[PDB]
Amino acid sequence: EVQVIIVGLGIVGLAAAIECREKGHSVHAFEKSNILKSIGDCIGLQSNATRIIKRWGDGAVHEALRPWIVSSKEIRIHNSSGRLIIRQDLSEVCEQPNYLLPRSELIRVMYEHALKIGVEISLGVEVCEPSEDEEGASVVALTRDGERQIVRGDFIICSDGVHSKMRKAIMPQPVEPRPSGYAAFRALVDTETLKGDPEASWVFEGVEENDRFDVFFLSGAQIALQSCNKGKVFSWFCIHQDTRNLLDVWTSPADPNEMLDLIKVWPIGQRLWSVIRHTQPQKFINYPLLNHKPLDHWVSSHGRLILIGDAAHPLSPAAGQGASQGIEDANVLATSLSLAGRQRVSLALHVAERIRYARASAVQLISHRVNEGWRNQDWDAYENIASLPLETWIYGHDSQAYTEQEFEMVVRAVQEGEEYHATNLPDKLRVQLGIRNV
Numbered sequence: 001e002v003q004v005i006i007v008g009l010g011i012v013g014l015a016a017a018i019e020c021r022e023k024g025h026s027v028h029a030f031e032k033s034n035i036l037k038s039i040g041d042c043i044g045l046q047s048n049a050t051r052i053i054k055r056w057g058d059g060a061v062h063e064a065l066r067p068w069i070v071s072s073k074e075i076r077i078h079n080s081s082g083r084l085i086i087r088q089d090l091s092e093v094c095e096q097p098n099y100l101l102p103r104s105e106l107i108r109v110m111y112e113h114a115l116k117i118g119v120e121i122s123l124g125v126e127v128c129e130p131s132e133d134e135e136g137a138s139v140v141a142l143t144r145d146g147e148r149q150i151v152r153g154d155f156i157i158c159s160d161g162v163h164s165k166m167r168k169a170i171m172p173q174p175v176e177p178r179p180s181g182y183a184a185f186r187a188l189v190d191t192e193t194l195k196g197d198p199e200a201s202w203v204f205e206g207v208e209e210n211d212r213f214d215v216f217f218l219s220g221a222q223i224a225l226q227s228c229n230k231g232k233v234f235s236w237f238c239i240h241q242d243t244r245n246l247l248d249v250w251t252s253p254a255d256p257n258e259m260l261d262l263i264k265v266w267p268i269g270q271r272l273w274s275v276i277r278h279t280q281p282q283k284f285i286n287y288p289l290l291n292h293k294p295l296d297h298w299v300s301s302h303g304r305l306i307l308i309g310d311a312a313h314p315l316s317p318a319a320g321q322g323a324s325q326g327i328e329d330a331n332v333l334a335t336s337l338s339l340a341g342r343q344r345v346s347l348a349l350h351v352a353e354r355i356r357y358a359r360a361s362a363v364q365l366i367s368h369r370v371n372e373g374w375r376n377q378d379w380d381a382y383e384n385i386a387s388l389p390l391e392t393w394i395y396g397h398d399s400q401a402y403t404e405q406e407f408e409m410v411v412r413a414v415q416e417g418e419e420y421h422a423t424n425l426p427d428k429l430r431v432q433l434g435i436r437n438v
């Protein structure tokens, strides 16, 4: 069988480990940090990701995620007066299960399942210096004491995220992401104090039957507020202007009073603050929003290393499709591997790339267009960021069925040196954004 080395066990790394293991390959994954640690807030997983997860363990992971199934029927969008300006229907977006849950709860479920099916995992191991010949690939596993050990396999999956040193070490970016001037406050609300605060009691209305999903458009502030799992968890997100050179990390605490000043001058500010103020000061995150440009390649020159997830195509955590596209990366890669075999590993990596590239790039450039904008307080139907790009061509898409159907055509385009034109995204969208094939 094929020996797979996975660097980075975030969401995408864990999914690739499970997807490769379930499709019959040997998997050794490395992670430098304690990942069973409660950090960050909520991740959303849309239908194109949950139909992939549905296959894991013949439904077992889906069943473990069942309390996190989204029950919202609409997105209720308001102006700064509190007036409901738009409802966005979710009956088709949620025809199939969507998930919304803390990142730490999703990491734990995926991680427990990866061990159970025999993924080999090494925590507390920083991986560096990839190398590849035409018969295999290798990485150097570092321990904190200075020790170096060569680890060998058939190819390397770099899922080490937005700060991929794997990417730096191989196919680095010419210039840094440039700061957009916007950042994102985001956090889990503390529920044990949210309860018993009577001025906040209003947020519990109906959350047992329909998870809250409210959005607020203010001047220089886009705010969302969400419940999941029958009101056991509340999260919130506020996009706002910021010129400071922040670090795009997930541990730098920020001053809650900045958020209070943003909203208190508006008639809706008091209601919203009665919830937001129950955030643990340790958990208040101000996360800069950078625009990353698509890479020229995800696969290295010798075909035995591939960047996936945030290493490949970092999206705004306000995309809605960030983790979902990464889970799609994993399934397509593992499906390509099984159709190719151990004698055609480099073929499999090049196929997965042609299948994923234009789609992932379209989500990248769309979700930034919808995030980018200079709207004033009359916010209209299609609209400057409302989370309305729930397109069926995104959430209704079955990436594994597409890979099985297209695999021989892509292989033909690889081997004959021609361009593959994926149809897993609208044709017009490619030309409108200027997507150039890999």
Ligand SMILES: Cc1cc2nc3c(=O)[nH]c(=O)nc-3n(C[C@H](O)[C@H](O)[C@H](O)COP(=O)(O)OP(=O)(O)OC[C@H]3O[C@@H](n4cnc5c(N)ncnc54)[C@H](O)[C@@H]3O)c2cc1C
Residues within 6 Å of the ligand: 007, 008, 009, 010, 011, 012, 013, 030, 031, 032, 033, 035, 039, 040, 041, 042, 043, 103, 125, 126, 127, 128, 159, 160, 161, 162, 163, 164, 165, 166, 250, 308, 309, 310, 311, 317, 322, 323, 326
């Ligand atoms: C601590 C943390 C909290 C986050 N919280 C949120 C959140 O609340 N909401 C949200 O929308 N997104 C959050 N994200 C980002 C989110 O996981 C990603 O945007 C995406 O969903 C998954 O991308 P990924 O798995 O490719 O990369 P990531 O999820 O960023 O994971 C990459 C992993 O690789 C590890 N790594 C890096 N270099 C090496 C190396 N050399 N050797 C070994 N391991 C290495 C990192 O330690 C990390 O565990 C968080 C990310 C992190 C790291």
Ligand SMILES: C[C@H]1CCN2C[C@]34Cc5c([nH]c6c7c(ccc56)OC(C)(C)C=CO7)C(C)(C)[C@@H]3C[C@]12C(=O)N4
Residues within 6 Å of the ligand: 044, 045, 046, 070, 093, 094, 098, 099, 100, 215, 216, 222, 223, 224, 225, 226, 237, 238, 239, 317, 318, 319, 320, 385, 386, 387
């Ligand atoms: C700053 C506010 C303003 C508007 N918000 C919307 C959002 C996109 C989005 C979110 N959750 C989503 C979501 C989705 C689809 C899209 C989103 O669908 C399912 C069905 C999976 C259920 C719950 O989860 C938020 C994290 C709340 C962010 C945060 C934010 C924003 O920019 N983009």
